[PDB]
Design a binder for this molecule. Structure first.
Ligand SMILES: [Zn+2]
Lengths: 226, 119, 128, 65, 119, 220, 101
RNA sequence: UAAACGAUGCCUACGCUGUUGUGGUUAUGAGCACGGCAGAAGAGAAAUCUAGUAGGGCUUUGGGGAGAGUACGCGCGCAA
């Protein structure tokens, strides 16, 4: 038993029709607002890991009302990672909720070389910093074959993102698992967007694919109607 | 759809010394899967210590007020004896609508309005 | 009074953050000229004009899209050629790009030229 | 690939997560002032948009052209 | 308090949009139509629905109720619009206007029978 | 210079009668570039005609760039300026919204009946603030008519014009409609149909329409 | 925590100000902090003006008024209900009150 | 000796807009010194912002609660 997907959004129409690729999506900074879009391309490959489960409470006249809060990561060990939190009356329901958030916040992560460009890229390109609440994390590139010098939570995140060597430092109240997870994901993300000296010349330009395919979509408009 | 059966499934599991939570969750699944549009379960007594409490669970639709309660709602109550005292169990189930009148009422609730589609 | 080489750096850093393309810098010294001329050689800034106002001096400069950050170090520490890589690893983001500038008997030079010429000096500033 | 989008007004990359980024498309005028099949295309970041600065900047660049 | 309640106003609003041409200024016609089209299981409810529908029909036929689109009165409003105004700014080709506007007319060399505002 | 469809004398006259050029008293650093002097008697700022024509041409150009015109969404949440939108959109093939813009209606799938935009048009954008705010979530450009008192963050094309008078609203919408049609070759000259259309768009009270009905019927 | 940006008083760019005394309890309060109230009251009540019209010897007469400025300390102003407690967003609204009679 | 408090050291920088004051000067367009207010962007655990950006210079000063700003010695004061 399963339910077929009817795309709620305009971009959703293009993916189901098979007119687009996942790099084109990320490349044009298009919104993702249907989890099925990520399933379509990566369902066969996604792994996940639960970082924390915790119980939260609200005081009432009758007593404490209580809920389960779960935070997890989705990633593929190659290029993609996303982080998601959910709250529900039940630990199962909470996982279902968290997965939606994670999928709607996947990002591609760039890689580079510690020295010369021999072999395959293996570390973050550039030294960078990520901040969330009271927590700050800094990442530094590392020689090939050092492995992941990283703390408990952040180590899992680098692994899912497909990074092989790193050096890490940290400041603040790292016991707060949500802050430590978000800050480390920002650190790698910030490193990918650093304004490298080559970047200005590597630049390319194209028309947005939703404008490019307007003719087909106008046919689909009439097909749905007729 | 019989609350008197489900309550005895519950009473059994207490004597089998199984947690009330797991027992109740199973009961609600059985009631819903069999087609009941909702149900209520309450357990009361010396359930987790010397201080007595009651724990109540609600799922789907349940009617409390008026004549629609007498035709859609079914109830059962039982109790189990344990070394520390008596634990009481209440179960209520709301029957599905049924056009042949076997599983529940033929006519749906008096306050529901439905407007026909146009040709 | 503020240090002139510090003033230079904050003026361009803030204007870059505010997405301006050009600035006027209000107090200039001999090493400030040489610092700006270094950033031009490596293509971090594009155009330089100097105004001879008889009141100290001032400069007008065009910024490139390549400049992320620059800064001065105070005080100007003395370094042996053995020491410079320690400062390189502390200041710069990557082993692949960016410049650490050092004053020497051969003018201003970067951390690569130090190896070529076989000379330490005094640490001055950095940009990437 | 996933890492080749750059903002035209602020000369830095646009991250995949930025909900406020947008792409602007415009036609080109024909002889005798009518329309054509060719398009101008601009990629603009969210940072300029939260400030309000995009209004003037676009007017500048249409003049540059 | 004689307020109609949510299902009664909702069914009223839907029926007037779904069957508008079938309805009239008469309570008994409107009661016949709701007896004909609707599922409503007590005369107590359909007396109240037809009451609200004949309360709307006056206001709706009297130049419309905002929040209640009727195609028959979209057409009536198109007829009222097709009754086009014969007023004109179009013949006001002679004009007087302030100096700043006269200099804008000069700087863009705009031809026409303009005058400085005599004021 | 910018390549713009030529001004023609009757069109110029038309806008001046419609009182397009009368700004307010206040001004904003964003809008200084469009003003050309101030009325000594009234402290009212006067708008530059040549610039008004330029940005009107620029708007028209980009309206032509988007296929399937239904994906253009025109909004104007006020009477005194209502009917203009209702006709204007039909002259180009766009969709429209008329009443209160239900907040979340671009964001949220569950609210029915409004399409995902690819270009949003707004008149008198002190109201319809929500529309400008919400389009920002879905990567759409925005075009607005605006006046010297008011200023906006996310509007890409600000067409300068009086927006506080029923004479004025008609003029902007009527002219722009024609340009878009012209740029595509649907019409051969712009002066063709001035007093007909510009009147059709212009707002009128029920009380006027009673009088006009009675007049018309007497003439019939 | 700091409840008001102006510390509950109108002093700025000064060291020290004159004190005044509360009408209701004679407590000292700084002039820039005291709650102020203005009064313009007829010497003769409204319920007597219709008798005044037959009592007076003059062809017409204008009743004399009496004028006052009153000062109150915080405790008295709250207790006499010249001012009331207000919500965190209302606290910021400033508007001139009516002159009493 | 004070809740001697805007509980925010002194010089010197770089920095968005609107509005309202006080004193001089004015191509009447504006400035210079000293202020108040309202947003924004950044910042911060938040409340909020004398708190934005930063290896500029120099002095004071804190290092879990208590015992304790107390004991002994010393310097000032008629004493307190
Ligand atoms: Zn008192």
């Amino acid at each position: 038993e399963e339910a077929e997907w009817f795309p709620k959004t305009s971009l959703g129409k293009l993916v189901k029709a098979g007119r687009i690729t996942l790099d084109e999506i990320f490349g044009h900074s298009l919104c993702i607002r249907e989890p099925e879009i990520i399933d379509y391309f990566l369902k066969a490959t996604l792994k996940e890991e639960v970082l924390v489960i915790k119980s939260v409470q609200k005081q009432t006249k009758a007593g404490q009302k209580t809920r389960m809060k779960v935070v997890l990561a989705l990633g593929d060990h190659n290029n993609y990672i996303g982080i998601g939190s959910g709250v529900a009356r039940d630990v199962v329901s909470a996982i279902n909720a968290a997965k939606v958030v994670a999928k709607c916040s996947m990002r591609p992560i760039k890689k580079g070389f510690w020295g010369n460009e021999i072999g395959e890229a293996h570390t973050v390109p550039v030294k960078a910093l990520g901040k969330c609440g009271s927590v700050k994390v800094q990442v530094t590139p590392a020689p090939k074959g050092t492995g992941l010098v990283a703390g408990g939570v952040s180590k899992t995140i680098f692994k899912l993102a497909g990074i092989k060597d790193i050096f890490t430092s940290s400041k603040g109240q790292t016991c707060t698992t949500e802050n430590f997870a978000r800050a480390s994901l920002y650190a790698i993300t910030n490193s990918t967007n650093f304004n490298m000296p080559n970047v200005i010349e590597e630049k390319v330009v194209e028309l947005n694919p939703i404008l490019k395919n307007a003719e087909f979509l106008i046919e689909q408009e009439q097909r749905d109607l007729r | 759809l019989c609350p008197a059966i489900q309550a005895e499934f519950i009473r059994s599991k207490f004597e089998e010394n199984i947690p009330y939570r797991r027992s109740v969750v199973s009961a609600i699944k059985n009631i819903k899967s069999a087609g009941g549009q909702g149900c209520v379960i309450e357990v009361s007594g010396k359930l987790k210590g010397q201080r007595a409490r009651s724990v109540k669970t609600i799922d789907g639709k349940i009617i409390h007020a008026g004549q629609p309660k007498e035709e859609f709602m079914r109830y059962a109550t039982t109790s189990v004896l344990l070394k520390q005292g008596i634990i009481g169990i209440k179960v209520g189930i709301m029957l599905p609508q049924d056009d042949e009148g076997i599983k529940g009422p033929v006519y749906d609730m008096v306050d529901k309005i439905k407007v026909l589609p146009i040709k | 009074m503020m240090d002139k080489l510090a003033n230079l750096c904050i003026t361009i850093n803030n204007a870059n953050r505010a997405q301006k393309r050009s600035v006027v810098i209000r107090r200039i010294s001999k090493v400030c000229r040489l610092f700006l001329e270094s950033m031009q050689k490596h293509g971090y800034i594009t155009d330089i004009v100097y105004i001879d106002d008889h009141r100290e001096g001032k400069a007008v400069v065009g910024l490139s899209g390549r400049l992320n950050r620059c800064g001065a170090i105070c005080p100007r520490y003395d370094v042996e050629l053995k020491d410079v890589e320690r400062y390189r690893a502390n200041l710069l983001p990557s082993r692949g790009f960016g410049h650490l500038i050092v004053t020497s008997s051969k003018g201003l030079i970067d951390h690569r030229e130090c190896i070529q010429h076989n000379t330490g000096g005094k640490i001055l500033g950095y940009f990437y | 690939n996933s890492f080749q989008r750059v903002c035209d007004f602020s000369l830095k990359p646009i991250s995949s997560q930025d909900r406020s980024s947008v792409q602007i498309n415009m036609v080109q005028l024909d002889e005798r002032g009518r329309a054509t099949k060719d398009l101008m295309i601009f990629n603009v970041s969210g940072t300029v948009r939260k400030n309000g600065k995009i209004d003037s900047m676009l007017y500048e660049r249409i003049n540059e052209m | 308090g004689q307020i109609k309640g949510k299902s009664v106003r909702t069914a009223s609003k839907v029926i007037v949009e779904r069957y508008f041409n079938r309805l009239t200024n008469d309570f008994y016609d409107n009661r016949n139509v709701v007896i004909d089209v609707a599922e409503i299981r007590s005369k107590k409810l359909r007396n109240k629905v037809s009451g609200c529908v004949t309360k709307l029909y006056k206001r709706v036929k009297k130049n419309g109720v905002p929040g209640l689109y009727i195609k028959e009165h979209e057409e009536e409003r198109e007829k009222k619009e097709s009754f086009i105004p014969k007023i004109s700014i179009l013949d006001e080709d002679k004009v007087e206007v302030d100096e700043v506007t006269m200099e804008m007319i000069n700087q863009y060399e705009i031809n026409g029978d303009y005058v400085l505002a005599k004021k | 210079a910018v390549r713009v469809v030529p001004l023609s004398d009757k069109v110029a006259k038309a806008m001046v009668q419609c009182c397009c050029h009368l700004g307010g008293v206040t001004s904003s650093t964003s809008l200084k570039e469009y003003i050309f002097g101030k009325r000594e008697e009234d402290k009212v700022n006067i708008i530059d005609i040549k610039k008004m024509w330029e940005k009107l041409n620029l708007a028209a150009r980009m309206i032509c760039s988007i296929p399937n015109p239904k994906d253009i969404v025109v909004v104007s949440s006020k009477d005194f300026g209502r009917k203009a939108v209702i006709k204007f959109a039909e002259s180009i093939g766009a969709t429209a919204v008329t009443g209160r813009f239900i907040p979340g209606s671009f964001s949220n799938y569950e609210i029915k009946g409004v399409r995902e935009p690819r270009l949003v048009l707004v008149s008198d954008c002190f109201a319809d603030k929500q529309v400008v705010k919400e389009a920002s979530y879905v990567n759409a450009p925005c075009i607005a008519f605006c006046n010297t008192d008011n200023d906006i963050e996310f509007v890409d094309m600000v067409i300068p014009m009086n927006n506080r008078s029923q004479s004025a609203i008609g003029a902007g919408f009527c002219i722009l409609s024609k340009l878009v049609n012209y740029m595509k070759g649907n019409i051969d000259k712009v002066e063709d149909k001035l007093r007909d259309h510009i009147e059709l768009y212009t707002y009128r009270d029920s009380d006027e329409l009673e009088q006009l009905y009675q007049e018309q019927k007497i003439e019939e | 925590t700091k409840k008001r940006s102006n510390n509950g008083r109108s002093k700025k760019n000064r060291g020290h100000t004159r004190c005044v005394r509360c009408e209701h309890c004679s407590a000292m309060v700084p002039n820039d902090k005291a709650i102020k109230k203005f009064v313009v009251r007829s010497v003769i009540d409204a319920a007597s003006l219709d008798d005044l019209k037959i009592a007076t010897i003059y062809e017409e007469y204008e009743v004399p008024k009496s004028y006052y400025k009153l000062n109150y300390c915080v405790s008295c102003a709250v207790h006499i209900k010249l001012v009331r407690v207000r919500s965190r967003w209302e606290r910021k609204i400033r508007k001139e009150q009516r002159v009493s009679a």
